[PDB]
């Protein structure tokens with residue numbers, strides 16, 4: 001229904017999901033992103049609920065460093081939601 | 084300093100603190116709120132960084148129910164920051 005609510009939900013669910021993987025969070029970024037786009041919905045299933053956020057998190061997230069990644073990536077641009 | 088940025092930092096940090104307490108998160112809500120106001124600061128040490136949120140989380144946080152509590156409580160009214 002709304003791309004902006006979708007973003008908010010996407011970043012928050014990814015972060016909450018990644019806190020179940022402590023020590024291993026870098027391995028589960030994509031797992032958590034997939035779960036988040038199912039939960040929050042998306043306008044393109046492949047793109048997901050915020051693509052830019054997934055890329056930022058893949059680049060920044062390192063083991064036992066999750067919070068820093070949340071603060072670094074949460075305001076990043078999502079990019080084209082459609083393609 | 085910005086009360087609104089304070090609130091955002093507060094609810095996020097409380098949420099992140101409580102995730103170290105899986106299964107027992109209800110015992111640590113006030114603990115985590117205090118940790119959060121240390122990180123995020125406050126305008127009244129006794130009130131903390133978002134009073135309304137602390138009340139909501141104390142009420143709604145149950146073991147293994149944290150995500151449900153965050154989603155419902157994060158945008159809640161903080162009340163008077165001064166007293």
Ligand SMILES: [Zn+2]
Nearest residue numbers: 067070071095
């Ligand atoms: Zn955070």
Ligand SMILES: [Zn+2]
Nearest residue numbers: 012150153154
């Ligand atoms: Zn949440």
